Amino acid sequence: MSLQDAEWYWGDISREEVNEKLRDTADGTFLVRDASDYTLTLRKGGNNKLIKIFHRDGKYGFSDPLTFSSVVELINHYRNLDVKLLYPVSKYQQEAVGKKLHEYNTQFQEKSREYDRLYEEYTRTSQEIQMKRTAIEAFNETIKIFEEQCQTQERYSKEYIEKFKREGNEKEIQRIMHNYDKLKSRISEIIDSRRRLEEDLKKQAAEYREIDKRMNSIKPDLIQLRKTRDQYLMWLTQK
Amino acid sequence: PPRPSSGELWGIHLMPPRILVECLLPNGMIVTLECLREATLITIKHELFKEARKYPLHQLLQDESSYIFVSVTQEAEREEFFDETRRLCDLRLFQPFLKVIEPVGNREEKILNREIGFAIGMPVCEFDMVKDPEVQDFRRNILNVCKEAVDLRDLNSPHSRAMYVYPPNVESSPELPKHIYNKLDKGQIIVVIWVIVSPNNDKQKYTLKINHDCVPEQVIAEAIRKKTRSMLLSSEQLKLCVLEYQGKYILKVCGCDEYFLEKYPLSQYKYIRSCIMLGRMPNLMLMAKESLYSQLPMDCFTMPSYSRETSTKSLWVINSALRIKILCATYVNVNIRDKIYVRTGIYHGGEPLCDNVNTQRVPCSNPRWNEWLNYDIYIPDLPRAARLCLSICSVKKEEHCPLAWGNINLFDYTDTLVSGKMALNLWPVPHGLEDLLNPIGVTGSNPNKETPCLELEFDWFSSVVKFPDMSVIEEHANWRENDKEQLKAISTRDPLSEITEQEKDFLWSHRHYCVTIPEILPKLLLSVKWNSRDEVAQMYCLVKDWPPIKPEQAMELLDCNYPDPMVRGFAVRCLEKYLTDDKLSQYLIQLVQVLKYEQYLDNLLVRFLLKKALTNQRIGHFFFWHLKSEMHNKTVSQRFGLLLESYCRACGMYLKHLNRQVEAMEKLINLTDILKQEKKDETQKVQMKFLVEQMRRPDFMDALQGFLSPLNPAHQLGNLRLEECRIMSSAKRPLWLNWENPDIMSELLFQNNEIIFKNGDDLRQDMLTLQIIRIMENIWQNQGLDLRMLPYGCLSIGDCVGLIEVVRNSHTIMQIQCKGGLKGALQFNSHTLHQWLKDKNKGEIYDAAIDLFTRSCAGYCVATFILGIGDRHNSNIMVKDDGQLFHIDFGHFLDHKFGYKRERVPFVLTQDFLIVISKGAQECTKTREFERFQEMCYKAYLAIRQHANLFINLFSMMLGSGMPELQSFDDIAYIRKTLALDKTEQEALEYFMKQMNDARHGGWTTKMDWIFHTIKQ
């Protein structure tokens, strides 16, 4: 029980470096703070709670009746539905050395760039896959129209072919057949083009997943390298 | 699906000048016709049937009139081109082919659906195929709001329809700030009424002197009196001519489409009040009511064709803990360079309701779990806004990492609780997300079915479970002295101030008294445990019987901290009553983004906004564009698309005007796409040569002439002054566009409408900034503090696409310094800015011009500092010829910004402005003109500090939008440092003076550097 020892006592650091010091933790991981004074950080119910301690009359306490007269002997009572505190957050955890962690920040940048390059070709592939999916549906609707055109040909041309036959004008039916062949030949060109696009779709969807695989492999490293570029305070300008 | 690009063909941006189109004739013959790129369908169909006569079975061809063209769009839909004016290039074809068919079915319904589909950006046919019953229910049910609004539109048959199209642009209150009343002459203002004598437009003046609080009908009466005075009439006849002709006329702002329809005082109208403060003479045009109503179409509202003993228990009954089975996942893309697990958690909005349970770690290549998860929570203790957040994760305990996530509403929109087996397609984790769960992310299943699909089973009970109605909630809910000092102190605390467990329990205990302080409700709601039906039910009864509060305070209850529908419904009910249409237009940017949080498609908020949009076209206009600009985003696509469909089906004839805007933007997007891509490595000359040549084409001239500006649809865009249009220097290839103002009396207002179309940069940041700047100006003005800001128009229309209003007669400080004034060539020095201002304002104009600069500078100086947009340079600060300062291009600054520097910020342009504020003066460090400037800033800085809660809530609501500078509340916390909310009111001013003094002295010493903005010091 000392003014400052460095066991669970930081300064009055912000609420940004508090929630992040007990995010995804058990019913504990606490630290001391100040308020607009004393403040204690708690965790119960899956939530992040915050308690104030009035230090008036040179004494301390949570509830209405003042029941203490020191800082570090207020924790011991509730330590062992006012639920208990479990594990504290230390001030000693990972010789004039800010230069070795220059290699972890070099790695962080070298992992950010390579991930950004992969995320670039992930979005670019993702967009192009969605483009090709719609293009197939357009080809499908195109073929349906061209096949509905063939029905219109066979429907109307029957009475005229069943008349040029009864007349011997052969190189007049040829004109009708030469066009119907052109229509059917175009349908095969559309279907053959749509089949090639289906090849490009599944060959890219495979490459799309290979990008996702390498991203999911690299992502864990970037998140843990965030902790290893930590900075010490009150020291100005570092590379 | 929505087409990806704005090109004419699939893959090709621009059709070659001559295209070979394979036309499918109605006799069954295919002929290939070489069509011109800009040819209309009328000409194409005509020349087709002439060429068709060469081919067999041409005797079967009927008249060209009896046929219509059909083809496949880039959206992959079958569009029947009923409007045959449309050009080949403007058809949005997938591949160049046309089919000649005979029309079947209802022609009117076919047209309306394509009109609505074009306005949205996706065909309506896709919504019809969505089987999700919530979607189809919303579509069917939301038409109630549409019909309600249309009935109010057609309530006062002719007049109410004019009020809809031309709503009175007025301030919220008629009260005039102290300094504005002093500008007018002893309670009255000089006003000029104009009249068009003949169709060969010439004009007659009627200069009047009228009380500022006169209504438009009284203004017309005074104009009639002046004319009838000069004629032979008795006192009774002069009296009768006014009475019988007061209500036969109508007033309108000369040079734009803003009408004085409602009986508000003339000073409350923004145009007149602006004229009063600026000292300009208002010019109004006299019009006949019979002339305005003649232009109103009288559009109808017709319903579409998509408006066509089970055991049940209550949730207040079932006794068990929450139990969820994690059956199996289809596939997970992993390298076999790492076992995987499924992390879950029950959340109430952002806050978790209980502990987060995990599944067993299973092999990387075999994704199956099949384990009942047991959550640490009671089922009846669930609130209405309870929802499950889960995700698939991996491990190197050594290194955890998520891959695919997905959230579900534990309750349906029917109030039913999930029961049984469910397949959920997962979403990919965003670029900048390291959290194992994504709780605040979008709720629901991923429409894209080709992603990892995690299946799960819910606990099946005997009957069907439903959340209890409010009457059952009141039953469970059924079961002093002076601590008022703290309640009124924490009620006035900013929403980002911490609420301790002492204060949370202290608020919950003294909650029954808190009703007397209704502004403490946001604090009280945070002081509640939402995993206890006991407390939730007691808050429910309090909320319903809670006094109405200011709409600014109610807007806070719609952000990401208040997901409970009873809390939101209260806020909507407060807005329905108290919020003015003026403030609605003001805060529409936040209110639209707030819609994203709401759990379900149908709710009170959408029904409120949609009705107001269908009741006021100025609200509806921006309501449309704010929704459409987010249609690129898949996460919002469905809801916003369904909501845009609701508006487009009911808005009326303005749907055609919106389509003309869309088509105009589509042209600009594609034109810029060519300059940014394809013609990337070409010089300015060649691209300008392409621009002039391409804009001159008839398809472009017709599309981008004669439509309403999306920045302000009151401004009409006539013919293009192509001699002014140009591509700007920026690498993002922006388009400068000039338009003639087709107003009959453009002479007396906007002679040229200039807009910057930029394709590439995200303009969402500028919109919010320019909005807050506008709000800051409003607060100062209402407190009798004249600080003239310039929140120029800006509107985002899509993914990094939008428009920027051009300020006339304005130049950057850099541009000011380029002139020189024949003092060498380009050589300048600080004094030049002042010399330029004096050289362009001579005489007594000078004194008022210097005043305008100081007032405008003080406003921006304060504003920029509070927001952190202060470190600006010559390129980003502009001065008008009259001498109004205003900062520009706020997004550029935000793109160019770890957390350890900024302790010293040198403003080099302090010296340049001090010379402007105080003429010459070698030692201008302390003058009487400067002492005035400082006091103006002090009054302003404290004025924004008083209204700090508003700005915090404004930013907090803008967290739904995916901005990189607005993700957590830690980003918004910065305002608390600048405003110094924790520090004393007097100490905050002492803090401000110190911050400014340091920036001033820092500017003197530093060496700026002109081009690269690198300080040598």
Ligand SMILES: Cc1ccccc1[C@@H]1NC(=O)c2cc(NC3COC3)cc(NC(=O)c3csc4ccccc34)c21
């Ligand atoms: C979020 C916010 C709200 C209110 C004030 C500040 C912030 C930001 N948080 C900060 O920590 C920070 C720091 C700076 N500059 C550094 C100072 O030394 C350099 C500026 C800004 N400004 C904005 O980001 C901002 C201004 S209007 C607008 C519209 C939309 C998106 C963002 C913005 C903030």
Ligand SMILES: Cc1cc([C@@H](C)Nc2ccccc2C(=O)O)c2oc(N3CCC(C)(C)CC3)c(C)c(=O)c2c1
């Ligand atoms: C004449 C002038 C003076 C200043 C400052 C340096 N001076 C004062 C201002 C108010 C009251 C007193 C003083 C004083 O020092 O006496 C200006 O500051 C800014 N910024 C905002 C504040 C930042 C720290 C972010 C720097 C950028 C801008 C944009 C100006 O236009 C400006 C203009």
Ligand SMILES: Cc1nc(NC(=O)N2CCC[C@H]2C(N)=O)sc1-c1csc(C(C)(C)C)n1
């Ligand atoms: C509001 C606004 N107004 C402008 N006015 C002008 O440019 N001019 C006025 C007549 C002479 C001409 C000139 N100075 O060359 S630019 C701008 C503005 C605001 S954000 C912006 C970026 C495009 C740089 C992002 N631009």
